PDB file of all heavy atoms in Angstrom:
ATOM      1  N   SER O  24      16.314  -2.511 -15.779  1.00  0.00           N
ATOM      2  CA  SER O  24      17.213  -1.367 -15.778  1.00  0.00           C
ATOM      3  C   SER O  24      16.456  -0.140 -15.291  1.00  0.00           C
ATOM      4  O   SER O  24      15.489   0.292 -15.927  1.00  0.00           O
ATOM      5  CB  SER O  24      17.782  -1.133 -17.174  1.00  0.00           C
ATOM      6  OG  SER O  24      18.606   0.020 -17.199  1.00  0.00           O
ATOM      7  N   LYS O  26      17.220   3.074 -15.058  1.00  0.00           N
ATOM      8  CA  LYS O  26      17.251   4.269 -15.893  1.00  0.00           C
ATOM      9  C   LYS O  26      16.359   4.111 -17.120  1.00  0.00           C
ATOM     10  O   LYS O  26      15.646   5.049 -17.507  1.00  0.00           O
ATOM     11  CB  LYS O  26      18.695   4.580 -16.278  1.00  0.00           C
ATOM     12  CG  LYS O  26      19.550   4.910 -15.061  1.00  0.00           C
ATOM     13  CD  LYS O  26      21.007   5.135 -15.406  1.00  0.00           C
ATOM     14  CE  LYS O  26      21.696   3.831 -15.739  1.00  0.00           C
ATOM     15  NZ  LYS O  26      21.393   2.770 -14.740  1.00  0.00           N
ATOM     16  N   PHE O  62      19.026  10.170 -18.455  1.00  0.00           N
ATOM     17  CA  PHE O  62      20.324   9.519 -18.636  1.00  0.00           C
ATOM     18  C   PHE O  62      20.553   9.301 -20.128  1.00  0.00           C
ATOM     19  O   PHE O  62      20.406   8.200 -20.655  1.00  0.00           O
ATOM     20  CB  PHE O  62      20.377   8.208 -17.867  1.00  0.00           C
ATOM     21  CG  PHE O  62      19.924   8.318 -16.448  1.00  0.00           C
ATOM     22  CD1 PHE O  62      18.594   8.134 -16.120  1.00  0.00           C
ATOM     23  CD2 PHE O  62      20.826   8.601 -15.440  1.00  0.00           C
ATOM     24  CE1 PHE O  62      18.171   8.231 -14.811  1.00  0.00           C
ATOM     25  CE2 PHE O  62      20.409   8.698 -14.128  1.00  0.00           C
ATOM     26  CZ  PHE O  62      19.079   8.514 -13.813  1.00  0.00           C
ATOM     27  N   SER O  64      23.401  10.173 -22.252  1.00  0.00           N
ATOM     28  CA  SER O  64      24.760  10.545 -22.607  1.00  0.00           C
ATOM     29  C   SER O  64      25.446   9.392 -23.322  1.00  0.00           C
ATOM     30  O   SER O  64      25.238   8.224 -22.981  1.00  0.00           O
ATOM     31  CB  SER O  64      25.558  10.940 -21.367  1.00  0.00           C
ATOM     32  OG  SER O  64      25.625   9.865 -20.449  1.00  0.00           O
ATOM     33  N   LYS O 123      19.769  -2.516  -3.978  1.00  0.00           N
ATOM     34  CA  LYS O 123      20.629  -2.995  -5.048  1.00  0.00           C
ATOM     35  C   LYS O 123      20.960  -4.471  -4.879  1.00  0.00           C
ATOM     36  O   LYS O 123      21.099  -4.980  -3.764  1.00  0.00           O
ATOM     37  CB  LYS O 123      21.921  -2.184  -5.089  1.00  0.00           C
ATOM     38  CG  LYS O 123      21.711  -0.685  -5.011  1.00  0.00           C
ATOM     39  CD  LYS O 123      23.036   0.053  -4.952  1.00  0.00           C
ATOM     40  CE  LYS O 123      22.826   1.540  -4.731  1.00  0.00           C
ATOM     41  NZ  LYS O 123      22.016   2.156  -5.819  1.00  0.00           N
ATOM     42  N   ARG O 126      26.364  -8.414  -6.750  1.00  0.00           N
ATOM     43  CA  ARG O 126      27.096  -9.628  -7.071  1.00  0.00           C
ATOM     44  C   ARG O 126      28.552  -9.459  -6.649  1.00  0.00           C
ATOM     45  O   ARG O 126      28.908  -8.553  -5.891  1.00  0.00           O
ATOM     46  CB  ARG O 126      26.966  -9.946  -8.556  1.00  0.00           C
ATOM     47  CG  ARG O 126      25.551 -10.229  -9.009  1.00  0.00           C
ATOM     48  CD  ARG O 126      25.497 -10.449 -10.509  1.00  0.00           C
ATOM     49  NE  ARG O 126      24.273 -11.129 -10.912  1.00  0.00           N
ATOM     50  CZ  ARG O 126      24.112 -12.444 -10.885  1.00  0.00           C
ATOM     51  NH1 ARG O 126      25.077 -13.249 -10.473  1.00  0.00           N
ATOM     52  NH2 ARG O 126      22.953 -12.965 -11.278  1.00  0.00           N
TER      53      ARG O 126
ATOM     54  P     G Y  68      23.988   4.917  -5.442  1.00  0.00           P
ATOM     55  OP1   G Y  68      22.974   4.335  -6.354  1.00  0.00           O
ATOM     56  OP2   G Y  68      25.400   4.471  -5.529  1.00  0.00           O
ATOM     57  O5'   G Y  68      23.956   6.498  -5.626  1.00  0.00           O
ATOM     58  C5'   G Y  68      24.514   7.101  -6.781  1.00  0.00           C
ATOM     59  C4'   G Y  68      24.997   8.500  -6.499  1.00  0.00           C
ATOM     60  O4'   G Y  68      25.851   8.501  -5.330  1.00  0.00           O
ATOM     61  C3'   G Y  68      25.851   9.129  -7.585  1.00  0.00           C
ATOM     62  O3'   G Y  68      25.068   9.691  -8.621  1.00  0.00           O
ATOM     63  C2'   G Y  68      26.668  10.164  -6.824  1.00  0.00           C
ATOM     64  O2'   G Y  68      25.911  11.349  -6.629  1.00  0.00           O
ATOM     65  C1'   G Y  68      26.853   9.483  -5.466  1.00  0.00           C
ATOM     66  N9    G Y  68      28.175   8.849  -5.286  1.00  0.00           N
ATOM     67  C8    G Y  68      28.385   7.594  -4.771  1.00  0.00           C
ATOM     68  N7    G Y  68      29.643   7.270  -4.680  1.00  0.00           N
ATOM     69  C5    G Y  68      30.313   8.383  -5.156  1.00  0.00           C
ATOM     70  C6    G Y  68      31.702   8.617  -5.285  1.00  0.00           C
ATOM     71  O6    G Y  68      32.636   7.858  -5.012  1.00  0.00           O
ATOM     72  N1    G Y  68      31.969   9.875  -5.801  1.00  0.00           N
ATOM     73  C2    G Y  68      31.014  10.795  -6.145  1.00  0.00           C
ATOM     74  N2    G Y  68      31.446  11.965  -6.633  1.00  0.00           N
ATOM     75  N3    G Y  68      29.715  10.591  -6.022  1.00  0.00           N
ATOM     76  C4    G Y  68      29.429   9.374  -5.521  1.00  0.00           C
ATOM     77  P     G Y  72      23.835   7.711 -18.590  1.00  0.00           P
ATOM     78  OP1   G Y  72      23.795   8.675 -19.720  1.00  0.00           O
ATOM     79  OP2   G Y  72      23.458   8.156 -17.225  1.00  0.00           O
ATOM     80  O5'   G Y  72      22.932   6.458 -18.978  1.00  0.00           O
ATOM     81  C5'   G Y  72      23.102   5.788 -20.224  1.00  0.00           C
ATOM     82  C4'   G Y  72      24.162   4.718 -20.137  1.00  0.00           C
ATOM     83  O4'   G Y  72      23.908   3.885 -18.975  1.00  0.00           O
ATOM     84  C3'   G Y  72      24.243   3.765 -21.326  1.00  0.00           C
ATOM     85  O3'   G Y  72      25.595   3.343 -21.475  1.00  0.00           O
ATOM     86  C2'   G Y  72      23.410   2.585 -20.851  1.00  0.00           C
ATOM     87  O2'   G Y  72      23.692   1.366 -21.504  1.00  0.00           O
ATOM     88  C1'   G Y  72      23.791   2.537 -19.379  1.00  0.00           C
ATOM     89  N9    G Y  72      22.809   1.887 -18.517  1.00  0.00           N
ATOM     90  C8    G Y  72      21.448   2.036 -18.521  1.00  0.00           C
ATOM     91  N7    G Y  72      20.862   1.312 -17.607  1.00  0.00           N
ATOM     92  C5    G Y  72      21.903   0.652 -16.969  1.00  0.00           C
ATOM     93  C6    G Y  72      21.890  -0.270 -15.895  1.00  0.00           C
ATOM     94  O6    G Y  72      20.921  -0.708 -15.267  1.00  0.00           O
ATOM     95  N1    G Y  72      23.173  -0.686 -15.569  1.00  0.00           N
ATOM     96  C2    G Y  72      24.321  -0.272 -16.193  1.00  0.00           C
ATOM     97  N2    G Y  72      25.467  -0.791 -15.733  1.00  0.00           N
ATOM     98  N3    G Y  72      24.348   0.586 -17.194  1.00  0.00           N
ATOM     99  C4    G Y  72      23.111   1.000 -17.521  1.00  0.00           C
ATOM    100  P     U Y  73      26.120   2.778 -22.881  1.00  0.00           P
ATOM    101  OP1   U Y  73      25.398   3.493 -23.961  1.00  0.00           O
ATOM    102  OP2   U Y  73      26.075   1.297 -22.825  1.00  0.00           O
ATOM    103  O5'   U Y  73      27.645   3.229 -22.924  1.00  0.00           O
ATOM    104  C5'   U Y  73      27.997   4.551 -23.300  1.00  0.00           C
ATOM    105  C4'   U Y  73      29.416   4.871 -22.912  1.00  0.00           C
ATOM    106  O4'   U Y  73      29.488   5.169 -21.497  1.00  0.00           O
ATOM    107  C3'   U Y  73      30.422   3.753 -23.118  1.00  0.00           C
ATOM    108  O3'   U Y  73      30.891   3.704 -24.452  1.00  0.00           O
ATOM    109  C2'   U Y  73      31.515   4.085 -22.113  1.00  0.00           C
ATOM    110  O2'   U Y  73      32.404   5.055 -22.648  1.00  0.00           O
ATOM    111  C1'   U Y  73      30.722   4.734 -20.975  1.00  0.00           C
ATOM    112  N1    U Y  73      30.453   3.832 -19.828  1.00  0.00           N
ATOM    113  C2    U Y  73      31.456   3.084 -19.223  1.00  0.00           C
ATOM    114  O2    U Y  73      32.622   3.054 -19.579  1.00  0.00           O
ATOM    115  N3    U Y  73      31.040   2.319 -18.161  1.00  0.00           N
ATOM    116  C4    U Y  73      29.772   2.240 -17.632  1.00  0.00           C
ATOM    117  O4    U Y  73      29.561   1.505 -16.670  1.00  0.00           O
ATOM    118  C5    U Y  73      28.804   3.049 -18.294  1.00  0.00           C
ATOM    119  C6    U Y  73      29.175   3.800 -19.331  1.00  0.00           C
ATOM    120  P     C Y 130      21.181 -14.293  -8.791  1.00  0.00           P
ATOM    121  OP1   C Y 130      21.777 -12.938  -8.866  1.00  0.00           O
ATOM    122  OP2   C Y 130      19.947 -14.599  -9.557  1.00  0.00           O
ATOM    123  O5'   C Y 130      22.303 -15.340  -9.204  1.00  0.00           O
ATOM    124  C5'   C Y 130      23.554 -15.357  -8.537  1.00  0.00           C
ATOM    125  C4'   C Y 130      24.395 -16.526  -8.978  1.00  0.00           C
ATOM    126  O4'   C Y 130      23.762 -17.760  -8.570  1.00  0.00           O
ATOM    127  C3'   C Y 130      24.590 -16.681 -10.478  1.00  0.00           C
ATOM    128  O3'   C Y 130      25.640 -15.867 -10.970  1.00  0.00           O
ATOM    129  C2'   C Y 130      24.871 -18.169 -10.637  1.00  0.00           C
ATOM    130  O2'   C Y 130      26.240 -18.445 -10.387  1.00  0.00           O
ATOM    131  C1'   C Y 130      24.040 -18.777  -9.505  1.00  0.00           C
ATOM    132  N1    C Y 130      22.765 -19.385  -9.949  1.00  0.00           N
ATOM    133  C2    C Y 130      22.782 -20.558 -10.714  1.00  0.00           C
ATOM    134  O2    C Y 130      23.870 -21.048 -11.051  1.00  0.00           O
ATOM    135  N3    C Y 130      21.614 -21.117 -11.095  1.00  0.00           N
ATOM    136  C4    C Y 130      20.462 -20.562 -10.721  1.00  0.00           C
ATOM    137  N4    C Y 130      19.340 -21.163 -11.117  1.00  0.00           N
ATOM    138  C5    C Y 130      20.410 -19.382  -9.926  1.00  0.00           C
ATOM    139  C6    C Y 130      21.576 -18.835  -9.564  1.00  0.00           C
ATOM    140  P     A Y 131      25.751 -15.536 -12.537  1.00  0.00           P
ATOM    141  OP1   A Y 131      26.954 -14.689 -12.726  1.00  0.00           O
ATOM    142  OP2   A Y 131      24.426 -15.055 -13.002  1.00  0.00           O
ATOM    143  O5'   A Y 131      26.038 -16.944 -13.225  1.00  0.00           O
ATOM    144  C5'   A Y 131      27.353 -17.471 -13.295  1.00  0.00           C
ATOM    145  C4'   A Y 131      27.400 -18.699 -14.167  1.00  0.00           C
ATOM    146  O4'   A Y 131      26.635 -19.763 -13.549  1.00  0.00           O
ATOM    147  C3'   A Y 131      26.781 -18.552 -15.547  1.00  0.00           C
ATOM    148  O3'   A Y 131      27.665 -17.960 -16.481  1.00  0.00           O
ATOM    149  C2'   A Y 131      26.397 -19.981 -15.900  1.00  0.00           C
ATOM    150  O2'   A Y 131      27.532 -20.709 -16.344  1.00  0.00           O
ATOM    151  C1'   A Y 131      25.984 -20.530 -14.538  1.00  0.00           C
ATOM    152  N9    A Y 131      24.532 -20.448 -14.303  1.00  0.00           N
ATOM    153  C8    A Y 131      23.872 -19.482 -13.595  1.00  0.00           C
ATOM    154  N7    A Y 131      22.578 -19.663 -13.530  1.00  0.00           N
ATOM    155  C5    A Y 131      22.376 -20.833 -14.240  1.00  0.00           C
ATOM    156  C6    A Y 131      21.214 -21.558 -14.533  1.00  0.00           C
ATOM    157  N6    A Y 131      20.001 -21.182 -14.129  1.00  0.00           N
ATOM    158  N1    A Y 131      21.336 -22.684 -15.268  1.00  0.00           N
ATOM    159  C2    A Y 131      22.561 -23.047 -15.668  1.00  0.00           C
ATOM    160  N3    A Y 131      23.732 -22.448 -15.449  1.00  0.00           N
ATOM    161  C4    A Y 131      23.569 -21.332 -14.721  1.00  0.00           C
TER     162        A Y 131
END
Side-chain angles (χ1 to χ4, degrees):
Chain O
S24 177
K26 297 176 287 313
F62 311 90
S64 60
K123 313 176 186 300
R126 297 176 162 276

